[PDB]
Amino acid sequence: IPVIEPLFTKVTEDIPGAEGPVFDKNGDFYIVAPEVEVNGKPAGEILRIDLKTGKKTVICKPEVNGYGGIPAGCQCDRDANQLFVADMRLGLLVVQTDGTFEEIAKKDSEGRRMQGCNDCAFDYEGNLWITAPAGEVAPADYTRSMQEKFGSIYCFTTDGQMIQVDTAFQFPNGIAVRHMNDGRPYQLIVAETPTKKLWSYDIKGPAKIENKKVWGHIPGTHEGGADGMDFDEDNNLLVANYGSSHIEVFGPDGGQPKMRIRCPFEKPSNLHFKPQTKTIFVTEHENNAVWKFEWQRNGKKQYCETLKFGIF
């Protein structure tokens, strides 16, 4: 498999469990620090990074009734410049730029208690597909599906429904949505970390997925596997292979990677493209840092980059 070795340039450092990189509607950059702790208890943070200086500013330190969150993944909204954040303890959060936030769901559409989330992906229809590898949200005792298959998948719809669309995953992690050229959402890709698998589903409509399939295979037998993921403008899927020192590049049809990207570290965690560029910001756990490198092309536009009142 072809492997490229692009220059990785340092962005920022010392962010415990550096995760969920995201750009907002203003082009501002954000990173989540799920692993920040205060006396052994979770006290996760959501930070804004000044790309010019690399200086950090924590805008939000989410906690509900004394229970600190473990913010792990982000997506920027389109109709409002707010961030939807997958939290391993609090579920789904909506965080404002001023640092204020709200807890979206205690329970799903079936009245079942909400599970802690890790990552999420907005489709062009505005529906948010979320991976839920943790057990029930706080106040429940923290649990994660690294060993047992109780990880779930949710779809938070435009009409405000938190619908569990699937479950029985062994740590569902990264997630991405494939769209047709006309903008129609038609395939969901879900990373199941320890099993070294990328699963796919046909999106038949909002909160409606069918035909679960093993879409791709993540290289290596190291501890870890597929973490964060995103598509480039040609629909190639770049997946951070935690523990392999590489970001895998799958073609539109999946299977085995068609190329790998060597990182100057062992634990790439998540990645995100800078709008209108080929620049991919990469978070990694070895140094709890953020880097950036130039990919072959621009990234696929995130939902936040689309236009509600767009003519074409």
Sheet of strand 128-132: strand arrangement: 119-122, 128-132, 151-156, 162-169
**Strand pairing of 225-231 and 237-242?**
antiparallel
**28 near 21, Cβ under 8 Å?**
no
Q: In the numeric block, which tokens belong to residue 33?
A: 């620090």
Which DSSP string corresponds to 229-245? EEEBTT-PEEEEEETTT
Q: In the complex with Ca ion, which residue's Cβ is closer, 70 or 209? A: 70
Is 236 marked as a binding-site residue?
Answer: no
Quick one: which of 258, 165, 177, 244 has its CA closest to 216? 258
Is 272 marked as a binding-site residue?
Answer: yes
Q: Mask: binding to Ca ion, 114-153, rule CB under 5 A, as x and -?
A: ----xx----------------------------------
Is 227 marked as a binding-site residue?
Answer: yes
From candidates 35, 103, 136, 230, binder to Ca ion by CB under 5 A: 230
Pick the catalytic residue: 217, 222, 246, 285? 285
Q: How far is the CB of 33 from Ca ion (least distance, A)?
A: 13
Given the rule CB under 5 A, which of 8-16, 90-98, 155-163, 224-232 is the region that contacts Ca ion?
224-232
Is 65 marked as a binding-site residue?
Answer: no
Alpha carbon distance 285, 301 (integer Å): 26
Alpha carbon distance 284, 243 (integer Å): 10
Given the rule CB under 5 A, which of 90-98, 165-173, 196-204, 252-260 is the region that contacts Ca ion?
165-173
Given the rule CB under 5 A, which of 141-149, 209-217, 219-227, 238-246 is the region that contacts Ca ion?
219-227
Query: How far, in Å, are 111, 163, 245, 261 from residue 242 at the CA level?
Result: 34, 29, 7, 12
Is 93 marked as a binding-site residue?
Answer: no
Quick one: which of 42, 71, 126 has its CA closest to 307? 126
From candidates 196, 272, 285, 300, binder to Ca ion by CB under 5 A: 272
Q: Verify whether residue 179 is a known catalytic residue.
A: no
Query: How far, in Å, are 43, 44, 61, 69 from residue 38 at the CA level?
Result: 6, 9, 11, 11
Which positions from 35 through 74 interact with Ca ion, judged by CB under 5 A?
none
Is 118 marked as a binding-site residue?
Answer: yes
Given the rule CB under 5 A, which of 156-164, 204-212, 225-233, 249-257 is the region that contacts Ca ion?
225-233
Question: Residue 178, interface with Ca ion (CB under 5 A)?
Answer: no
Question: Residue 196, interface with Ca ion (CB under 5 A)?
Answer: no
Query: Would you list which residues are annotated within the binding site for Ca(2+)?
Result: 19, 118, 173, 227, 230, 271-272
Q: Which residues are catalytic?
A: 285
**Contact residues for Ca ion (CB under 5 A)?**
118-119, 173, 227, 230, 272
